[PDB]
Design an enzyme around this catalytic site. Sequence first.
Site, PDB file in Angstrom:
ATOM      1  N   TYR A  28     -12.744  -4.514  -4.101  1.00  0.00           N
ATOM      2  CA  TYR A  28     -13.932  -3.844  -4.620  1.00  0.00           C
ATOM      3  C   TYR A  28     -15.149  -4.654  -4.126  1.00  0.00           C
ATOM      4  O   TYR A  28     -15.712  -4.377  -3.056  1.00  0.00           O
ATOM      5  CB  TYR A  28     -13.900  -3.557  -6.139  1.00  0.00           C
ATOM      6  CG  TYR A  28     -15.101  -2.757  -6.591  1.00  0.00           C
ATOM      7  CD1 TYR A  28     -15.307  -1.479  -6.161  1.00  0.00           C
ATOM      8  CD2 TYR A  28     -16.034  -3.288  -7.425  1.00  0.00           C
ATOM      9  CE1 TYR A  28     -16.445  -0.759  -6.510  1.00  0.00           C
ATOM     10  CE2 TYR A  28     -17.177  -2.577  -7.786  1.00  0.00           C
ATOM     11  CZ  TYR A  28     -17.381  -1.300  -7.309  1.00  0.00           C
ATOM     12  OH  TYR A  28     -18.499  -0.622  -7.732  1.00  0.00           O
TER      13      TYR A  28
ATOM     14  N   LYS B 243       0.749 -10.628   6.183  1.00  0.00           N
ATOM     15  CA  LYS B 243       0.899  -9.246   6.700  1.00  0.00           C
ATOM     16  C   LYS B 243      -0.444  -8.815   7.201  1.00  0.00           C
ATOM     17  O   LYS B 243      -1.365  -8.595   6.393  1.00  0.00           O
ATOM     18  CB  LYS B 243       1.296  -8.311   5.575  1.00  0.00           C
ATOM     19  CG  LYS B 243       1.514  -6.875   6.002  1.00  0.00           C
ATOM     20  CD  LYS B 243       1.830  -6.007   4.876  1.00  0.00           C
ATOM     21  CE  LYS B 243       1.822  -4.567   5.428  1.00  0.00           C
ATOM     22  NZ  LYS B 243       2.037  -3.500   4.485  1.00  0.00           N
TER      23      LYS B 243
ATOM     24  N   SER C  69       0.854  -1.199   0.000  1.00  0.00           N
ATOM     25  CA  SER C  69       0.000   0.000   0.000  1.00  0.00           C
ATOM     26  C   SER C  69       0.885   1.242   0.000  1.00  0.00           C
ATOM     27  O   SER C  69       0.695   2.207  -0.777  1.00  0.00           O
ATOM     28  CB  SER C  69      -0.918   0.005   1.245  1.00  0.00           C
ATOM     29  OG  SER C  69      -1.605  -1.217   1.333  1.00  0.00           O
TER      30      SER C  69
ATOM     31  N   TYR D 278      -2.173 -10.771   2.510  1.00  0.00           N
ATOM     32  CA  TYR D 278      -2.158  -9.399   2.970  1.00  0.00           C
ATOM     33  C   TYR D 278      -3.532  -9.061   3.458  1.00  0.00           C
ATOM     34  O   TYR D 278      -4.504  -9.041   2.711  1.00  0.00           O
ATOM     35  CB  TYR D 278      -1.714  -8.540   1.807  1.00  0.00           C
ATOM     36  CG  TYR D 278      -1.407  -7.129   2.074  1.00  0.00           C
ATOM     37  CD1 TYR D 278      -0.714  -6.405   1.134  1.00  0.00           C
ATOM     38  CD2 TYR D 278      -1.767  -6.492   3.271  1.00  0.00           C
ATOM     39  CE1 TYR D 278      -0.437  -5.053   1.324  1.00  0.00           C
ATOM     40  CE2 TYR D 278      -1.472  -5.149   3.473  1.00  0.00           C
ATOM     41  CZ  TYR D 278      -0.818  -4.455   2.462  1.00  0.00           C
ATOM     42  OH  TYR D 278      -0.511  -3.142   2.602  1.00  0.00           O
TER      43      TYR D 278
END
Lengths: 298, 298, 298, 298
Positions: D108, D163, D45, D134
């Site tokens: 989404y 993560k 990110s 993630y």
Amino acid sequence: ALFTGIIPPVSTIFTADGQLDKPGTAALIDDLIKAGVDGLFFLGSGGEFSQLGAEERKAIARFAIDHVDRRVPVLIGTGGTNARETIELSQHAQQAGADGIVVINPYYWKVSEANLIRYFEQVADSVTLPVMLYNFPALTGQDLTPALVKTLADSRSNIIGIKDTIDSVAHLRSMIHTVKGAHPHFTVLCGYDDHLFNTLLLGGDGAISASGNFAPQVSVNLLKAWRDGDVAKAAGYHQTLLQIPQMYQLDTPFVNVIKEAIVLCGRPVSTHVLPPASPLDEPRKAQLKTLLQQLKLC
Amino acid sequence: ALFTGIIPPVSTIFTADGQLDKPGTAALIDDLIKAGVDGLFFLGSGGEFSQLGAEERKAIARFAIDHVDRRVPVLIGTGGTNARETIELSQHAQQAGADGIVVINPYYWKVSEANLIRYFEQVADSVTLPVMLYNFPALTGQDLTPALVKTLADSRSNIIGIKDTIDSVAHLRSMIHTVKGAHPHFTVLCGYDDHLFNTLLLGGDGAISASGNFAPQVSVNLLKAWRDGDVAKAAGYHQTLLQIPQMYQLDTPFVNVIKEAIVLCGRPVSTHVLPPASPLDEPRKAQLKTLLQQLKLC
Amino acid sequence: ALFTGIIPPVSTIFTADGQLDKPGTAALIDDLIKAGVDGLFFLGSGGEFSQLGAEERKAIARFAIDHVDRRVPVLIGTGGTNARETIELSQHAQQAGADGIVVINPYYWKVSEANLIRYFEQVADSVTLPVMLYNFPALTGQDLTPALVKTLADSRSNIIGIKDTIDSVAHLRSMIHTVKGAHPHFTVLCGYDDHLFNTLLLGGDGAISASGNFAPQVSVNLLKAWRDGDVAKAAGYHQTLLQIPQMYQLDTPFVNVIKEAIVLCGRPVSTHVLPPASPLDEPRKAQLKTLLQQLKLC
Amino acid sequence: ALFTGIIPPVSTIFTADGQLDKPGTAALIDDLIKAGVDGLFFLGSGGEFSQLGAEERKAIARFAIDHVDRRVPVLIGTGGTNARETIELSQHAQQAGADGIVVINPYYWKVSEANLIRYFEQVADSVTLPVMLYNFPALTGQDLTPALVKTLADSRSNIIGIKDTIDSVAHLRSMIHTVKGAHPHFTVLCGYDDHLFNTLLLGGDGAISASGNFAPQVSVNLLKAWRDGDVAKAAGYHQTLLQIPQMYQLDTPFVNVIKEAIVLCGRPVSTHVLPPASPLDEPRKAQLKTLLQQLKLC
Ligand SMILES: *[C@H](C[C@H](O)C=O)C(=O)O
Ligand SMILES: *[C@H](C[C@H](O)C=O)C(=O)O
Ligand SMILES: [Mg+2]
Ligand SMILES: [Mg+2]
Ligand SMILES: [Mg+2]
Ligand SMILES: [Mg+2]
């Protein structure tokens, strides 16, 4: 007011090998125009924008614009997270001949209000087309509030409407009072079939909703009855639209369901969907079928 | 099916010094019966149950039951967080002469599903009255899902309906299909004015909504028109009910707004509310007034 | 700074009939004092305040204050939805000899900011005692944000701390920076076992957490090590506090788990809990015992 | 266990035209290797993956992998909404010499559990590389629960870590117990600076967090101290890590803050960020500088 009435979020038809299916998309487009819709929206949620690459989206949009051939207004969905790509896609849409674009808020990062306003202002500056905003807070995690939308309409004169996709009479009501109160010709469309009737009665303008793909006549005929003043007749169609969204529970994403319904309702197209959606199983296909039969739609 | 139709969540009228106002509460009850409502619900959210002590609640329920004097069916709200007190209040309601009770889920701790089912089963075992469940997930933080509600209806034969207080067509729809599908006479009432029309069209049974206090005729006439098959006339009342909930934005809690509306619409009662609600300021009272004037309700 | 250090939200011990167990509760109180706690908090969430009636609460507070007999500072939880009762409970507390009161935000209606501020001010102006705020947004549905808490502390000099019951380092950090920044002696206590170490490292003041009941030595020892400057030792105790909350997963509510844990760690108190809580079943009791064994707490 | 210890979500440095700045990025990579990090994660990110096109991402990954030149293990973030692109990017990553890939859930549509499991299995089957999951629910709107992650680790032997980007000690604890319990060598890394210490104390493996970029020494030193057995020292570094995330409040997205912090801590890289992020303004730059000074990081 622009882009009023019934504007389906058109499914993109794909081949079994995942290519744009031009004959099947073109047939669907022709069915929808023959059904009397007021425009067509390509590359919305239902059109699978979020599972398509940028060059794929351009190719789809060009084909769809060219096939429509100005018979009805065309909107292209050009949003996503990559703001540079939104501008590219939106400029490409204008160049290819679209009549407007539909732009969701970025839906990974929920950016600050300043950044959000900035983003929409930049997108709206990138084109001379009309821009329809797209609120879908269940997916975006960030609501385009009526106050914000009014601030956007105040800022840019080509931000001229919204597809408000939310199961909320309050949100629709307040979008209408707040935005249309300042801007009487700003367009408010609901994104759910079962809110069309209320959206009209509240002083809004229409719907962009999935049932426009397989049962457009129900919405077309509601809008006509409403505009004719035959309120009871409109209410009758609403009773149908109240029930349709049961179907959308059959899967998530339910792009597969919509395409299966197009087939069951008389238009045989490949129902291939892009990952991470997947094909609808046979038991749920039959369930879809019985729901459509129950509502007298096939 | 029990407790169908229009059943207002009656405001409790208090004096300036915070006592039950028996003359004003009695006049309100009489106005509502005259307007043709199908029952009356005391000590709902709107009746301020959550700001009253248990002895206060008992005194209010007895007065209200005795004043109604069996003219229409009476429901008493007996819920809260203290389960032992729910049972006491519920047995007191049966002993005082109530026709049924309305029970929300505990709203501090969101208890486990096992504890929740158990709680409702114990409450339902404590009385021979009909029990109406009360879903209000915006305040409780825990939804009574259609599946859960059906499990409850399956378990106890005196759990016979629900007031579903949620701005959601899907939730109403699915409550109806799921619970009424298994139990055709289970009662589904919506808790919002603007969902009455849809509730009827979905196959539900009515509303317990705040506008029943100040404009009962709107809902009463809608229901009558629906039952007469005059859909267009019902839709006309609905258009009014679509706008009413604007008022409720004027404060939170908005129990003050409702009582102010009762006054503005022609019944002069003390508008005192219990803390932590507070009296409505004059600017907002005038705003209420202009909204009611615009909808042609005073 | 008032009410710093380790202050257990003491369990209320009841007989099978749901009445206060005075020998049991007394023994627990004496165990905790003897373990070196800095204070005692009665009728917090863990003390079942929300399942007790007003008169019951007063009796409990009276008894506890009286048994503690000023050996350590005593906090009484006085909150609810019924603000008039909150004032009566708080005044009762002050009269009964409490050192302070602990008041949560009303948790049915999530009241407007204006009503919330007014509520807290009114509760604080009703006593001359110090007032601790109580934030538990998971249960209340309404966060006491660090800005709002600063506003309250700015407004009334007797609003002198907060129990911040949230699994969020960000919330605790911001509470400390925003509020203690403006009011260096405002007390910030976390409500969860696994946040005590961080709370202290952040400049906060201690903890009101459930393992205070069955393993107060872990927290008392952690704090002593910290205040003594032996951070390695403190971290060691923290490693145990990090693991303890596993057990609270065993039921919801978990006040049953806490009392069974008191038993398993050597204090045979009755483990009765008030509805809608229910008894922990034998398999989960055995899982809890195994967990306590693994952590060396019994 | 693969990819343990300190692995920064490395910032992507761009010129003013939004193109990859190779000397800037290379210098940052060298700084981080020089600081003793255990690995490097590109296009997380913080690396702006969601504002970059697929061809851009491939260029960046190729460059980064090649610059690192196998001095430390290299992770490439390959996720998005377009699952075919995910596979193409992951295969590209393997070809390009990456040691592993990091894949977030589609953000989404929040896809059904069946679709989600299938997605991850299909992505994992497309490469022979190891795959780190993630989780970033604040942004995705859909949590990868410990149970789901266990199911993924049970299904594919190359799904080898996560993560876990959440401000929640409970989530990290349960992730570690549920997954590492079943798979002792499955790697758990927290995504936030202020949870590294707790992650290590809970039995987890390290951190992928933003301060890796501008203050890698704090995390590297903390981990060395912990692995060395000097827990007091580790706690000291933790105390700085606890304060760092203050700065990320200065903007949303805060990728701008991170790059300005890299500049302020001695590495003059270009701080350009891709839209819809925007430049941090001068007042906030000055607050950031002040914060870094107070914490002894510049
Ligand atoms: C609009 C309809 C709605 O968002 C349902 O998914 C679309 O773009 O599909
Ligand atoms: C029911 C009506 C609904 O909750 C409106 O707010 C009530 O008990 O007040
Ligand atoms: Mg659609
Ligand atoms: Mg009400
Ligand atoms: Mg507790
Ligand atoms: Mg980052």
